[PDB]
Ligand binder design. Structure first.
Ligand SMILES: [Ca+2]
Ligand SMILES: [Ca+2]
Ligand SMILES: [Ca+2]
Ligand SMILES: [Ca+2]
Ligand SMILES: [Ca+2]
Ligand SMILES: [Ca+2]
Ligand SMILES: [Ca+2]
Ligand SMILES: [Ca+2]
Ligand SMILES: [Mg+2]
Ligand SMILES: [Mg+2]
Ligand code: NA
Ligand code: NA
Ligand code: NA
Ligand code: NA
Ligand code: NA
Ligand code: NA
Ligand code: NA
Lengths: 510, 510, 255
């Protein structure tokens, strides 16, 4: 269907003949520069390539306010997620309306020139409540307060070039490009599938049934910008998509990556996804259970109800101009060797099997088997590689502050001991000297599968620098992972405690 | 047989009742301390545990000189390798005869008290020529000049404790201990096998035949102190020995580790090995082809003739007091599915197969198959782990000084590109800032299998800090591993050059 | 169909006889092979019959045998073509051919080695391996020679305890025959059963015939001993080693 607002605002194409001129202005000595944050790069790419039609810049306060309370742009155009350029006070003060500023990437690549319409300090409590529902634990609110700038700069954009990406150049289709790809194949009915996760047999099955019921071709449009915190990296995920797309019948599916920065804003985001896919050329879209929802908070309560998304999108059905296909999740029937829509089988009368994310995570952590009815083997092989089991995981042993035995000798004892065991893990007694440049290397070593022995703890005002994954404290204190019987426990006893701890946790296997 | 000189100089046992007294003296405030170098720890352990009977300390000049020219101690006792305590001038000056000094390990563990008999500056050109044959490339001469102190301190030793080791506590038998292990099994004929390498089927076969011909039990006595430069680490090797010892018929073999510091001094060392094994309780010993020889020098010439060792040991036969079993190397006969002594088959009349070290190294580098007739599978599995093939090897790409493209962008491009590929290798753009504390981490990352992208070169006065294995220079210069067409070559072209280079070299496999 | 014939291995005469016999059983044709029904060569390595005596003799009686004799066209395997072809059709020096002699087949079976499907069908090879197991599965006997002055009761006990350490499932027995025929005749049955027997003393020479000599080894100082002792009073532990390593060299034990 036609782009939201009727026109594809592909600013790259619009400004093609001003590229040199704009590029030269961006590189002028007198122009004020702003370095785009990683989320802003995600947003500006979608504005510049028309992914966010009718947007043609970051929202000024007039539009922003309507989006916050009315879920629309001041002109009444449905638009549920505010896209603004958040800056700090120091920069906001240097700019006034009509000021033209340059937006760079990595402090070296000019992306666009923004003509300032306004500068304002939004009430983040209202946005937090109105747009994201108010739970301080909602990733969007966390970002809203802890990362986002306190001042929004609204203004019209002029394009120099889209944010630079060196990976998957072939798959990052812009709206215009994707539309031409469909057009060259004569596809005029396309159902799009959103995801920020690996795809298993069930996803393959459900998307194909969608294709069959909507009489449409399939578009697997995964998000590769910012997704939920803790999600699997997009490189791993792209590898999985590239693998699963080969499992569809020839000529029925197309894989294209979307550099979107999700807010995990549930029902509002679901609407936004529909609009965005319409701009990219899809005729149909599937909205899932708790679509774009971040789940439950600490108190175990739902950030959104499982059907809020589908209900909200349905309420805007008459103006979305993109058909929404009903979400029919499928489950595996052992006794019939097939998948079937969950709404068609009687739980208490028919056998069904499925592997929850929690269980999948466990199996991967212990190197256990994962059945082909759940996920294709080539897909599982990829997941095991990016997330190796414990015998292949790195780790660190931190000699606590309470230790009175010789740190130099205990570290040497641990090294010599670990080195006896096989498995190929690399070991290092690592001294950081409380230097940040060294502390930041700890998780890289662990990520590399290495075993580090750290002679002493770093200062508390440095915790933030070190990731806590697979990092274990050896100390007399109660908060120690490997508790010492006493501060002067004999080195050989300590060594045993560590070895058996690592064994119990799967790092060593004999 | 009886220890060389007639008495096992086990100083640990001799001084058992002075341990507290000696320990207290070593920890006195006024006593002069010397930190033992890694080779001296190897030597003192063998002196203290009687491994070097009749030695009871480091050689004074009187004995040392006789060993250098006469191959004997001043009393006429056969002794071919000088064992001295080499120190720098600053320390030598602080000591005079009768001075009692303490010998520590790791600057914290007291090993012994040495009563200085003399202090002298040896003519290292004579020792180099007389003891090690004079080739400046002989590892012993290299050490003699580049590492060893210029002053020898001769003196009698009193034991506090043997050098601390936390790995393989069970297998490091002292002479007295090994002798009791043989005695408890009623073994009175034992043939010992020396090695600083992995053991393959041929070694298993030849040692068993030795046992059969000498009517003796087998002692696999591998060196785990210092061996030849470039040798496989002893942890890997011990794993292999522990594995192969299980392939002998029950009750025929015993595995014990020897903390010797080899000099790779060919025929002289061969004699020394015989003496040492006699002290440890062996009745027989096998002297191999080019036994304890370092091979050929740069000009491709032999450091020693292949039979110098066997000939020298044979010339001392009447006073060694340990039988030397003839070395009968075996080779595999495909057509008969068996190994047979090489001196029994006609090369041109019978089929024989064998895998040279060079070829073994290749197969391991490319992950190729290695047949069970060559080495037991459990042994090969261990070698593959410590020395993984290229797809599992780490590496570094150094952005040369000639580069005029943006280093920050080229590094980012390489990262994003590498991250597309699968395989689980971990990647890092690593900035060392010419800091030693960071440069020394490069090979640890590579040893961990990681891929590092280094934005700029380090200063030449730092080369020594970084190992050169799997480190590749991207530069316009001729000495670059990955040569740029020009200093400003487009980033995408450079990326391709690197990817294809790494592929050609096996790091990436598609 | 099985024929309860008692062959005489009488070469060409027997070949004729086989033709007659098959005619009686109803065959219209018969193949006479190379050295058909021949026993091979004698000690001096000379042929009991010429390779074509049989075919020639049968051919000379062709007009009265009343059964057609089909020419014998032996086939060989062509690796490069994955097929068998008549040996009389290929040029030895121009075309690759593979084949496994009886001697080699026997070896492979004795050592448990692989035998390729181009030579014999796997189900056929499985059967041959069962009736003729490789050395690790073969029985054997160790006879303590008459020259031994060490204690026979202790050496036998030492050997037993030692063998019992090793795995593999072979059953062991210190077997006393007391020169009784009823016991001596059981030796090869035990060996045929895969068992390992330790025999404390030799039987009288007028009894040799009763015991098969397969896998029976003499431990003695004499020159004709399979496992030669350094001396009659060699220490028991040394003797044990000599035996273990001998059995290993010969494939009975594998570690
Ligand atoms: Ca703030
Ligand atoms: Ca719920
Ligand atoms: Ca205490
Ligand atoms: Ca010097
Ligand atoms: Ca040579
Ligand atoms: Ca240029
Ligand atoms: Ca013949
Ligand atoms: Ca005697
Ligand atoms: Mg882009
Ligand atoms: Mg020690
Ligand atoms: Na429409
Ligand atoms: Na999904
Ligand atoms: Na709700
Ligand atoms: Na002696
Ligand atoms: Na060797
Ligand atoms: Na020579
Ligand atoms: Na003839």
């Amino acid at each position: 269907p036609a782009p939201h607002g009727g026109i594809l605002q592909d600013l790259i194409a619009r400004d093609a003949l001003k590229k040199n001129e704009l590029l030269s202005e961006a590189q002028s000595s007198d122009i004020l520069v702003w370095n785009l944050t990683p989320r802003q790069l995600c947003d500006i790419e979608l504005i510049l390539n028309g992914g966010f039609s009718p947007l043609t810049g970051f929202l000024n306060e007039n539009d922003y306010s309507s989006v916050v309370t009315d879920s629309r742009l001041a002109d009444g155009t449905l638009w549920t997620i505010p896209i603004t350029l958040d800056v700090d006070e120091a920069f906001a003060n240097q700019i006034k309306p009509d000021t033209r500023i340059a937006l760079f990437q990595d402090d070296e690549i000019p992306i666009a020139i923004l003509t300032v319409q306004d500068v304002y300090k939004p009430n983040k409590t209202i946005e937090a409540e109105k747009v994201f529902r108010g739970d301080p634990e909602h990733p969007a609110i966390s970002y809203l307060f802890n990362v986002a700038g306190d001042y929004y700069v609204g203004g019209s954009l002029e394009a120099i070039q889209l944010p630079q990406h060196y990976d998957y150049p072939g798959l990052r289709k812009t709206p215009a490009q994707l539309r031409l790809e469909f057009q060259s194949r004569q596809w005029d009915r396309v159902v799009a599938f959103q995801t920020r996760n690996p795809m298993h047999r069930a996803h393959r099955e459900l998307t194909v049934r969608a294709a069959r019921e909507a009489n449409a071709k399939v578009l697997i449009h995964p998000v590769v910008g910012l997704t939920k915190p803790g999600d699997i990296d997009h490189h791993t995920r792209v590898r999985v998509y590239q693998e699963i797309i080969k499992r569809y019948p020839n000529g029925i599916a197309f894989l294209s990556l979307l550099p979107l920065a999700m807010r995990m804003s549930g029902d509002r985001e679901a609407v936004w996804h529909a609009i965005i896919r319409k701009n990219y050329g899809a005729s149909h879209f599937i909205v899932g259970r708790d679509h774009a929802g971040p789940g439950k908070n600490s108190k175990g309560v739902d950030f959104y109800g499982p059907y809020d998304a589908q209900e909200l999108v349905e309420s805007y059905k008459h103006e979305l101009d993109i058909e929404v296909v009903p979400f029919r999740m499928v489950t595996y029937l052992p006794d019939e060797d097939r998948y079937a829509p969950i709404d068609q089988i009687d739980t208490t009368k028919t056998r069904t099997l499925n592997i929850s994310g929690t269980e999948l995570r466990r199996r991967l952590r212990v190197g256990g088997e994962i059945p082909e009815w759940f996920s294709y083997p080539e897909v599982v092989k990829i997941l095991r590689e990016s997330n190796p089991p414990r015998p292949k995981q790195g780790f660190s042993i931190v000699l606590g502050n309470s230790l009175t035995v010789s740190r130099e000798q205990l570290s040497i004892a641990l090294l010599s001991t670990f080195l006896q065991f096989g498995g190929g893990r690399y070991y290092k007694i690592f001294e950081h000297n409380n230097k940040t440049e060294l502390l930041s290397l700890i998780q890289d070593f662990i990520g590399s599968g290495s075993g580090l022995i750290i002679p002493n703890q770093w200062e508390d005002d440095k915790d933030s620098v070190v990731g806590k994954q697979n990092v274990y404290l050896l100390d007399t204190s109660s908060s120690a992972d490997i508790q010492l019987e006493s501060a002067d426990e004999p080195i050989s006893h300590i060594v045993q405690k560590v070895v058996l701890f690592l064994e119990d946790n799967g790092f060593f296997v004999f």
